[PDB]
């Protein structure tokens, strides 16, 4: 018969379909890449536009002065998880006078996105996150799923045709650990580029960049601060 009408029905194979389907929302979305060095975490996301008249939609959200996320999926849901994180990090500053540890913030999202995945008539949030964060243990990338799992990453990418981007990250995983700042960002661009057709590439309207560092609170580079990091790239090989 059918086992895809609720999140509250196991399947005779031991898999729950309504949590698999959430996963497709994350691949329907736009590609993003994040990596870490040893002092810097960097998010670069591929913004995508609707027509030539519309503007490109924003894929990098400022969360606090040391966090930042890059969404991928249903954006309505992506702002219910952003307001719930902003609220955890204006709550810790309020109670302890310290910033929240990145790993600790992902624990709270892991609990709260687990609940609706075990409760009749609800649904899991159709949005995968990449959390860039810098605290005492240096930098971190986390990757959240609508399964409610999460992984502490060395560098990740989710969304459309991210299989290709992960290939590039598994070929240069050694360099990253010891790059300078400009060189790290360039790696992430070369990886983000491989998600497109070879019939185009990155411009200043397709990419935004989010850096969080040892001495540098999370910043967003919009459309005209992307030129210093987009320049100094070679052209993609044919």
């Amino acid at each position: 018969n059918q086992y895809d009408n609720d999140v509250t029905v196991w399947s005779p194979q031991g898999r729950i379909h309504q949590i698999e389907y959430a996963m497709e929302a994350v691949k329907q979305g736009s590609a993003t890449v994040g990596l870490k060095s040893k002092t810097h975490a960097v998010l670069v996301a591929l913004k995508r536009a609707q027509s030539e008249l519309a503007a490109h939609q924003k894929k990098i959200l400022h969360v606090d002065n040391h966090i930042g996320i890059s969404i991928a999926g249903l954006t309505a849901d992506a702002r219910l998880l952003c307001n719930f994180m902003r609220q955890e990090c204006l709550d810790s500053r309020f109670v302890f006078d310290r910033p929240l540890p990145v790993s600790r913030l992902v624990s709270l999202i892991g609990s709260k996105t687990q609940i609706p995945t075990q409760r009749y008539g609800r649904r899991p949030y159709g949005v995968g996150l990449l959390i860039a964060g810098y605290d005492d243990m240096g930098p971190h990338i986390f990757q959240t799923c609508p399964s409610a799992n999460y992984f502490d990453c060395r560098a990740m990418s989710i969304g459309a045709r991210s299989q290709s981007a992960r290939t590039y990250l598994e070929r240069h995983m050694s360099e990253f650990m010891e790059c300078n700042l400009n060189e790290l960002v360039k790696h992430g661009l070369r990886a983000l580029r491989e998600t497109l057709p070879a019939e185009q590439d990155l411009t200043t309207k397709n990419v935004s960049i989010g850096i969080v560092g040892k001495d540098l609170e999370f910043t967003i580079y919009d459309d005209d601060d992307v030129s210093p990091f987009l320049e100094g790239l070679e052209e993609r090989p044919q």
Partner: protein, 213 residues
């Protein structure tokens, strides 16, 4: 029985020029008849063009600051801009009023620059309500600083003098002066005097010694 308030002294002072806004204060944090500590600024930088002074009940001074700094962060997350001076002032009032039947016991003074780049000061009652002044003394030694200082800035009850605008150097030397004379006759002022100057170049921090008696 149990008093939910106690007085803790502290004086703040704010002169609005036309290119700068000075927010001063003492740092003595007294309770009753002992001196808890000698080093506790009553001035907290908020954004780059805004300082706020808090004097009165250091229990509520402290809470109220973390509540401003948390809806101030909240605003930059929803609107994607920094919050102007006149915005904060209007917001501070709605926070104070939200506890009208068990209030914050806090004298506030926001000094900063509006959007013409000139000086702006807003003083508060403990229960809300603010106006727009060019100088307001607050706190325990508010009655020492009001009659003198408000002569020199406003030229009240003077006759046949020049109404020259305030130079950054004529004021700073004024502040240091009125405080030296209020720490002689008032018991809740002294130890040190922290001045905050707010121009569009940033926010400088001075310190001058007062009477340690």
């Amino acid at each position: 029985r149990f008093s939910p308030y106690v007085f803790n002294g502290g004086t703040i002072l704010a002169i609005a020029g036309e290119d700068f806004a000075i927010v001063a204060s003492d740092t003595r944090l007294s309770e009753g008849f002992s001196i808890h500590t000698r080093d506790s600024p009553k001035c907290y930088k908020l954004t780059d063009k805004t300082v706020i002074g808090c004097s009165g009940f250091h229990g509520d001074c402290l809470t109220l600051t973390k509540i401003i700094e948390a809806r101030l962060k909240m605003y930059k997350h929803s609107n994607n801009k920094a919050m102007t001076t006149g915005a904060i002032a209007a917001m501070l009032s709605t926070i104070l009023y939200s506890r009208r039947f068990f209030p914050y016991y806090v004298y506030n003074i926001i000094g900063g620059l509006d959007e013409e780049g000139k000086g702006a000061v807003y003083s508060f009652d403990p229960v809300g309500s603010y106006q727009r002044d060019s100088f307001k003394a607050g706190g325990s030694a508010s009655a020492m600083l009001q009659p003198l200082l408000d002569n020199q800035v406003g030229f009240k009850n003077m006759q046949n003098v020049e109404h020259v605008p305030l130079s950054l150097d004529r004021a700073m030397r004024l502040v240091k002066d009125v405080f030296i004379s209020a720490a002689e006759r008032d018991v809740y002022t002294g130890d040190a005097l922290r001045i905050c100057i707010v121009t569009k170049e940033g926010i400088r921090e001075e310190t001058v010694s007062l009477r340690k008696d």
